[PDB]
Design brief:
The structure is cut from a larger assembly and holds two copies of chain A and one copy of chain C.
Chain A lengths: L2 E7 L7 E6 L3 E6 L3 E6 L8 H4 L1 E4 L5 E9 L7 E8 L4 E8 L6 E5 L5 H4 L3 E7 L8 E7 L4 E9 L4 E11 L9 E6 L4 E6 L4 E5 L7 E3 L11 E6 L5 E8 L2 E8 L4 E6 L3 E2 L12 E6 L5 E6 L3 E6 L5 E6 L9 E2 L12 E7 L12 E6 L4 E6 L4
Chain C lengths: L1 H17 L4 H14 L2 H21 L3 H21 L2 H15 L7 H19 L3 H14 L3 H14 L2 H17 L4 H14 L2 H12 L3 H6 L5 H12 L7 H9 L4 H7 L1 H7 L9 H9 L4 H10 L4 H9 L2
Helix pairs in contact in C: 1-2, 2-3, 2-4, 3-4, 4-5, 4-6, 5-6, 6-7, 7-8, 8-9, 8-10, 9-10, 10-11, 10-13, 11-13, 13-14, 14-15, 15-16, 17-18, 18-19
Classes of the chains: A mainly beta, C mainly alpha.
Chain lengths: 381, 392, 319
Amino acid sequence: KVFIATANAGKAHDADIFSVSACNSFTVSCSGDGYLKVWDNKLLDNENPKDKSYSHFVHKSGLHHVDVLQAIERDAFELCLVATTSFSGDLLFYRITREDETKKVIFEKLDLLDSDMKKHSFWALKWGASNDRLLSHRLVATDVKGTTYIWKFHPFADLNWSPTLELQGTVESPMTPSQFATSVDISERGLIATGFNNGTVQISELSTLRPLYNFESQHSMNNSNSIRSVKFSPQGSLLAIAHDSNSFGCITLYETEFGERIGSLSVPTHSSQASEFAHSSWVMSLSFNDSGETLCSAGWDGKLRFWDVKTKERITTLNMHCDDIEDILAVDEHGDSLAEPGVFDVKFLKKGWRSGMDLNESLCCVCLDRSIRWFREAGGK
Amino acid sequence: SKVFIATANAGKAHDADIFSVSACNSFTVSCSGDGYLKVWDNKLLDNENPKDKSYSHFVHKSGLHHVDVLQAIERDAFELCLVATTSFSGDLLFYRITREDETKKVIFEKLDLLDSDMKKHSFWALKWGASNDRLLSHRLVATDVKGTTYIWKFHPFADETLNWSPTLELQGTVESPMTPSQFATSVDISERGLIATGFNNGTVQISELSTLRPLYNFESQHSMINNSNSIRSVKFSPQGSLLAIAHDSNSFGCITLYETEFGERIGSLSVPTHSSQASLGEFAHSSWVMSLSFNDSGETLCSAGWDGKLRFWDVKTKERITTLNMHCDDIEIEEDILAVDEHGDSLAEPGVFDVKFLKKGWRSGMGADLNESLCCVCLDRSIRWFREAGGK
Amino acid sequence: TVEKLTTASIALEQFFKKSPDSQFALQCALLTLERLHHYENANELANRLIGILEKKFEKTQDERELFNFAIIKGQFARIHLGLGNFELSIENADLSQGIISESSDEKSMKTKISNHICLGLSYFFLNDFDQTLNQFQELLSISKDSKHLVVLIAKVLYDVGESDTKEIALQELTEYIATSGADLLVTLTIAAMSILDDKREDLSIILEELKALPLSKQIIDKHKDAPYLIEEITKRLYRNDTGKQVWQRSAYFFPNNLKVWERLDKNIQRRIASNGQNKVTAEEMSKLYCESKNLRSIQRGMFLCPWNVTAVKALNECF
């Protein structure tokens, strides 16, 4: 299973692109210039994604996170909502709908947070698609104080579009004193993972909002061991934690429902020959594919690494400086990862979303140099 | 009897932070940043809201950050009750308190005791010295931002038959030993006639109240970073020659015990606090110690920390007896619970601005063993009262 | 560490009351106090030990005693360097050097280096007798090649200002940065050094170096000096506001570091230091509280620390 580049867009933003997410309709990215940019997925085989890119301003301090929800909930209504947090710590919402006349995207700023709520300083978010869990859509978020927020989103009151956010509840940190909640994730099962800046990760189940159980990383600090990303695999009860070692990025695999650690995703490394890790630099993000058979890690070594879940072995590697196809970790004598760093975030796009030369799953990533790239699995193209 | 149990609450007692609290036989007086002095009746009857028996009175626009009250029975006939306060402006305000003929409501009479030359000073801390045979006349000590301690004698009567006309005679001053002079952050006066003056450089100076003579001065250690250490509160032991000093070691609070005969360090109160993630540190409080108080017996030392914890230590063993965690929702009245502040910050665990021990009998309680009591004011603009579960 | 050293200091302090005049104990007291910057106590104990040593040396005066005394005087010099009275530092240092100079004893060497670091600085501060400071610092350079000492020499020689001296400093710093070449302090001091000289050619290069500081080093930079200099240089050189961007990239990396939210968003900084996520001092806490810019919090701030100008002013100006 190897991946080929389909399209890319150079200098997509005037500042760093921190996060990217996508739905069937389009791939949306956010950045430090405070602009949400939505890029139409269904792109003509020979065309520039920029011509189809629609940009919108949200906040001056810049955005550092985004997740978008798309659902055909009931009747005929195609509901698409982008949610995004800024460096200011405000949580913004934008309904996305294209114009009838020009077919261009229109953003509608939706106010869904009361005064007391909005007064908080949010950091990370994620949507919770409609499923058999409970009927309605779930939104999880974090704040600078380590507290996780769980809302239930209602797009209709009492077919009348009147969106509201019902705060199901909150789940505070395991720690005292609190620590920064860097990452959060919600599973199709109904579990909630919250990862902080010290190595601690707490897993709490949504239906009860109790805290099921939590994991604390052994590496102690002048040596930061921070959680960068947490992700629940859609298949099985698996949980994948991306975290720092000092100057390296590590992926560890735990199992939900028994709380058993199951392993770590490493690749051979030689610098002093002392030696292992997942990337020569930190892992900035993770993302499972639809089948949950392959995990993609976005490393700050300027590389995307695709690992097979069952085998716990690396499937393949992609440079973001090289366009060409043995990825031994290049580590300097001092232990510093020699590699021009590029990557900030990556996402898997389901088969059928980014259409063109449709039978293969697609991929999207955002890097340092303000460039956003798309990729496709090899089914002949 | 070192287990304290809460008795009465008043939430949202003020519109701005309550900095100092004091009390006497008649009442507990609390001042705050809204510049309002608030007299709270100590004598309450079962299940009665303290706010119903609270009397409030304006003082200064800037606000008040220090208050102390003196209640004595001067002549065999006459009762004297006098509140002194310092405002953020630096002004030293005095208020005579008396109660209405039948209504028993509180009445304030602002007394003017200082001369124009004195009023120019920017006072910070103050303490009343009761007539405990130190000399015969009630005294008042105060501190200014320049690092000097002012000592007045308070004569409530005119040349000794008895008519009401108060006068404060300036006995004199005690200048700090250091140069440059440092900010005098707090003060206290002992039963045996000693003044302790605590500066913001970890230095404390012990002087004689009677003779205005400085006896000595000692310093607090770990002076790596200059701006770190400063003294938050100093308090003498009633019983012994002991003196408890509450100072900061940047981001942490420390209580050190000195004995005052020769003025040497005899110990330090600490408990396992938080340092370097998993590691364990030896400080009194994980945050700054804001104020100290000794029980009547002098066996227990209560320390109020910025970590929202009241910790009661045993002075003899120098170990900790017990700890009380303050919460925004301790308050008996729901509508008076202050969960979040103006800026939407959380006050779940509100730091304790101040704490005070109330002598047995001041706080009257129904069907409780007549015993000692406790009072404290906390960052959630809340004032709490506890009683020492014990017997008599 | 500081706490343990403190405890050592108190321990010895109490020990002395029981039996003072124990040379070793006094030496310990000097070392710990020096570590703690408690220089006055060190001065006093140093006087008492110097007396106690001189009295004993007066009788026998075996060379080893003179060596011990030399080391002790060398200590005294550092104490004075701490105190600031550089004249006595010079005197004592020269004396210690006089006794120990040509000794060539394994232990004496450290004490010699010690003397040189005292004299060079002492002169530098003293009368700006830079030629002495130069003839001495240049000597110290030839003595060893260790990072911090190099940074010291570079700092001094550059702070002189003489056209050759600055070149000497920068050259040496660069050569170390070529030797092992990875660490911040060298790069940061070099970046500032280049920063204020305002030489456009060098700035692009050193900024290029700063941007490419490895991830490992960025962690060791708790204070986040690099994103500051990078901003200053970028903003002054490229003449673009984009020089801010870095601070974001930091906040994404170290979302709980105060120094970054200092630049980006004050409320988060204040909120981080609230419940003790980050241990912040009283003054800074006061500053953060006042930075909320409303009465209640300025009162809180001023009360927490009534001896910082900005808070007092902050309270006056709202009336």
